């Protein structure tokens, strides 16, 4: 018939088959349009963090384009590759190489631009939703409005038109480089080279995991050693994962088949007919999917770990609801709260800074930590200063668990601790392992705890105090107020006091941490969600091509006597392995990466991390179910 009718019919088949690609394209266009709208939205300036909101969104916008253009270019590459059969037939019909390209371009234009127009409308509808999501995540109260911005529409049109220009170049160069002769064993034993590759892949993966388990144990001392170790473990995991998909997966599949003997059920035929010979054909694609998914899960879990513990960490860095550097501002602030009929308590806790030899009780080598245990600045608090546990003469206590502290500083339960002041040193003894933190991190280090000494010794060395080791403050001012609802009124009144931002408030530190890590979680979570859609669609298309390659096997099985329902169970198990192996290794990479750095961010790691995989697995199994439905259709039409 006429060429136009053929183009329309081809579009209908493409829409029916690649419906996931259209949804992914619409989702990518809609999400990108919302992100650009958020970048130029004047209401986004209400967020306050270390990184500017506009700059962070723009960086995410560039990353979103890269993660989408790569998926779109790869998806179109395999679309033409699977269409090469009809490409050669058209060349055999008699049309020139330009008319066939025109037909392919016309069908692509009517589909790509149609989804782009729908995606723009979808992006306009969801622009308010993503803005409200960001505001809720970073905990800011403002008014979100639904508006259409001309610049956002122009930017997304230019970017996606340029992306399609790359598609047209790729499609044109594929037609020209393919001649007429284009429309016309895999099973073998395991070789010695496959033996070495398989063993090396597992060895490299476990070697990287073991290094992570001992990354912060104290083996490395300098920052350069830590950085070179990080490069080594990243390289080992990537190489190990690539070798795992190349030869290791074949050996594990070969081993179980040999162990099972020659008695294989229907489920063991389809499952073992793909992972032995098809996993290694696309090792690079699987490795990239696994690596990025593990990185996305790891980054998201770590950001959620900090977000979950942000309030605890804000309470960690402080000692009360407020911290004051000078007495004059405290006098100004106390009068402001006094006239506000709110009861408050101001505590004055002098602290002492000196050098203490803790290496005598430092378990193992004293080179694990960054510095000298013999000469290091430790906060000293008098016994009368706090109301915890009374300390007798010749005894000491260490306050502040700070889990990161324990790993770096592996404290013991008994020993002799040596304090080296400006004058004659005195020997003490400590137990440690406390919770309540008596000193804010403005004098002592972020993880360094504070030693408690009997007040008799503290009053004794008042005349002999090291002038070398003392920052500015000595006495510490902490202000707390009654109930909990008074936090907001105190915080809003405290804002006008620290005009130079020289003070430090618990609420302000929590809010800054909430906004900074919330923005990172928002960026990583949405980018990971986009990658999840693209990776699932790519794997769905790979299974689509593999399904057509396994059609003769299904025809033989049906002719043998196996029913369609019997093959459904085998397909479900096979698809579970195909969509589960990348997920299982991906989760293992994320779990061992989080377990090696969770203490650097927060204190609770189990609950936030488990939720991330559970959410990720649930949203990842949808593509596996869709692949099963396509497989059910294929085997139904097989015979």
């Amino acid at each position: 018939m006429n060429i136009n009718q053929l183009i329309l019919r081809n579009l209908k088949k493409n829409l029916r088959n690649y419906y996931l690609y259209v949804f992914a394209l619409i989702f990518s266009v809609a999400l990108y349009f919302a992100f650009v709208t958020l970048q130029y939205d004047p209401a986004i300036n209400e967020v306050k963090a270390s990184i500017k909101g506009a700059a962070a969104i723009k960086t995410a916008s560039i990353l979103l384009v890269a993660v989408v253009a790569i998926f779109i270019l790869y998806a179109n590459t395999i679309f033409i590759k699977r269409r090469s059969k009809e490409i050669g037939l058209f060349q055999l019909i008699g049309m020139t190489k330009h008319k066939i390209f025109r037909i392919l371009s016309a069908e692509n234009v009517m589909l790509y631009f149609g989804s782009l127009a729908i995606g723009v409308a979808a992006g306009f509808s969801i622009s308010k939703l993503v803005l409200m999501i960001l505001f809720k995540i970073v905990d800011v109260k403002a008014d979100a409005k639904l508006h259409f911005s001309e610049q956002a529409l122009v930017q997304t049109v230019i970017v996606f038109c340029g992306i399609y220009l790359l598609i047209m170049i790729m499609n044109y160069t594929f037609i020209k480089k393919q001649s007429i002769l284009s429309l016309f064993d895999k099973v073998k034993k395991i070789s010695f080279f496959q033996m070495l590759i398989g063993a090396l892949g597992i060895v490299l993966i476990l070697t990287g995991y073991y290094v992570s388990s001992e990354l912060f144990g104290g083996k490395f001392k300098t920052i350069n050693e830590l950085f070179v170790a990080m490069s080594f473990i990243l390289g080992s995991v990537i190489i190990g994962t690539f070798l795992f998909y190349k030869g290791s997966v074949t050996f594990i599949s070969n081993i179980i088949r040999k162990s099972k003997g020659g008695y294989l059920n229907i489920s063991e035929v389809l499952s073992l007919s793909s992972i032995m010979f098809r996993m290694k054909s696309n090792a690079l694609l699987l490795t990239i999917i696994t690596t990025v998914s593990a990185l996305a899960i790891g980054l998201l879990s770590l950001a959620y770990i900090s977000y979950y513990s942000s309030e605890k960490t804000a309470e960690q860095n402080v000692a009360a609801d407020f911290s004051f550097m000078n007495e004059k501002d405290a006098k100004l602030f106390e009068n402001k709260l006094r006239e506000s009929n709110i009861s408050f308590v101001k505590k004055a806790t002098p602290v002492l800074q000196a050098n203490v030899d803790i290496a005598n009780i430092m378990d193992g080598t004293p080179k694990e930590m960054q510095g000298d245990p013999g000469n290091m600045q430790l906060a000293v608090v008098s016994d009368k200063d706090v109301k915890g546990v009374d300390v007798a003469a010749g005894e000491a206590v260490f306050s502040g668990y700070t889990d990161l502290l324990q790993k770096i500083m592996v404290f013991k339960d008994s020993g002799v601790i040596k304090v080296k002041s400006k004058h004659e040193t005195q020997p003490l003894k400590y137990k440690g392992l406390r919770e309540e933190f008596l000193v804010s991190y403005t004098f002592t280090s972020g993880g360094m705890p504070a030693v408690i000494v009997d007040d008799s010794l503290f009053k004794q060395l008042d005349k002999d105090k090291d002038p070398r080791i003392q920052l500015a403050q000595s006495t510490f001012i902490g202000v707390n107020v009654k109930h909990d609802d008074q936090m907001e009124k105190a915080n809003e009144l405290f804002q006008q006091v620290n005009k130079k931002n020289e003070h430090l408030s618990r609420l302000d530190t929590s809010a800054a941490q909430k906004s900074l890590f919330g923005m990172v979680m928002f960026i990583v979570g949405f980018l990971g969600l986009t990658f999840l859609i693209t990776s699932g669609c790519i794997l769905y298309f790979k299974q689509m091509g593999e399904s057509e390659d396994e059609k003769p096997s299904y025809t033989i099985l049906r002719k043998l006597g196996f029913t369609q329902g019997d093959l459904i169970k085998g397909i479900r198990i096979k698809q579970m392995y195909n969509f589960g192996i990348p997920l299982v290794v991906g989760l293992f990479h994320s779990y061992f990466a989080v377990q090696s750095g969770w203490f650097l961010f927060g204190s609770e790691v189990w609950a936030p991390m488990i939720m991330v995989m559970v959410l990720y697995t649930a949203l990842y199994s949808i593509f596996g179910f869709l692949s099963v439905l396509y497989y059910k259709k294929v085997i139904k039409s097989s015979l």
Partner: protein, 116 residues
Amino acid sequence: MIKAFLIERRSWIAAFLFQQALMLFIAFVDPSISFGNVLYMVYLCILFFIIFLWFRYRKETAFYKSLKTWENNLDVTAINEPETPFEAMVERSIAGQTEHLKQTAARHRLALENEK
């Protein structure tokens, strides 16, 4: 047959559940609107939907229950008059083939006596 009707309307069941999932998600994310009032109303709406689902099943599946007249010699029993357009087309096709069965029996009876 409960397991059959639920599979029939599993798409509509999921759509209503997804609508409520979106209904909760927007209310939770958006600070201007409350979430407690939406939660209470959703529970009331789900309870009303369950009652409506049972009422819809009883009225609609009655026609397909009577379609089991061909299991045995119950063929003499008449199919209940349909109301929905989908069932009306089904009944029209069944009636058309029934007349097809009637006319071929008459044609054979005509042929049998003509040959005599």
